[PDB]
C-alpha cells in the first residue's frame with residue numbers, strides 16, 4: 001500500500017546517518033560515499049572498521065535512519081584513535097537509490113539468510129518500526145522516526161554523490177572549521193563537548 005515516501009512523511013524522518021573516521025571525510029566530500037568493492041575497484045585508500053563484512057554485502061554502503069548505530073560506532077571509537085564524524089544524508093536516498101532495509105544489523109542470523117529481494121521496498125522498510133523485532137521491543141514512547149532496533153541498517157547498493165550529504169557533524173569545533181575551510185559550500189556542525197546529549201551518545205540517553 002504505502003510508499004517509502006509516505007512512511008517517511010508520516011513518521012517525520014528527516015535524517016539518515018553514516019559514521020566514518022575523519023581520515024575518510026576529504027575523499028567522501030570529493031567523490032561521495034562508495035562501497036568496499038568500489039573503493040577496491042579504483043584501489044582508493046580508506047579507513048574501514050569491519051574487515052570481513054559478514055553481512056556479505058561489500059558492494060553496499062551502510063546507513064542508519066534517524067540515529068547512528070550507537071553500539072557499533074561506540075565499539076569502533078574505542079579501537080582507532082582520532083576524530084570521528086557523522087554524515088547527515090537526505091532521506092531521498094531510500095528511493096532514489098537501490099536500498100535494502102534490515103530491521104536489525106544486517107549480519108544478524110535473524111535476517112542474513114533472507115532473500116535480498118525481499119529486503120527491498122516499502123514492506124521491508126516498514127519492518128524497521130515493528131513493536132517487536134526479534135525480541136527487541138519498541139517502547140511506546142519512542143518517537144516515530146526512530147527504528148525499533150538502533151542497529152537497523154540501510155544497505156545502499158549504488159554510490160551516493162556528495163550532493164546527498166546535507167551536513168556533517170564533528171566531535172569538536174576545530175574539526176568542523178578545518179573542513180569548513182576546505183569545503184566552504186558545505187554545512188559542518190559541531191558540539192562544544194560530548195558531555196551532553198549528542199549523536200555520539202547511546203540513543204536511550206540521547207532521547208531520555
Ligand SMILES: NC(=O)c1ccc[n+]([C@@H]2O[C@H](COP(=O)([O-])OP(=O)(O)OC[C@H]3O[C@@H](n4cnc5c(N)ncnc54)[C@H](O)[C@@H]3O)[C@@H](O)[C@H]2O)c1
Nearest residue numbers: 018019020024027028032033034046048049050062063064
Ligand atoms: N557507517 C555507518 O554509519 C553504519 C551504519 C549502519 C551499520 N553499520 C555497520 O557497521 C559496520 C562497519 O560499516 P562501515 O560503514 O564502517 O563500513 P566498512 O567497515 O566496510 O568500511 C568502509 C569505510 O569506507 C568509508 N568510505 C566511504 N566512501 C569513501 C570514500 N569515498 N573515500 C574513503 N572512504 C570512504 C566509509 O565511511 C567507511 O568508514 C558494518 O557492520 C555495517 O553494516 C555502519
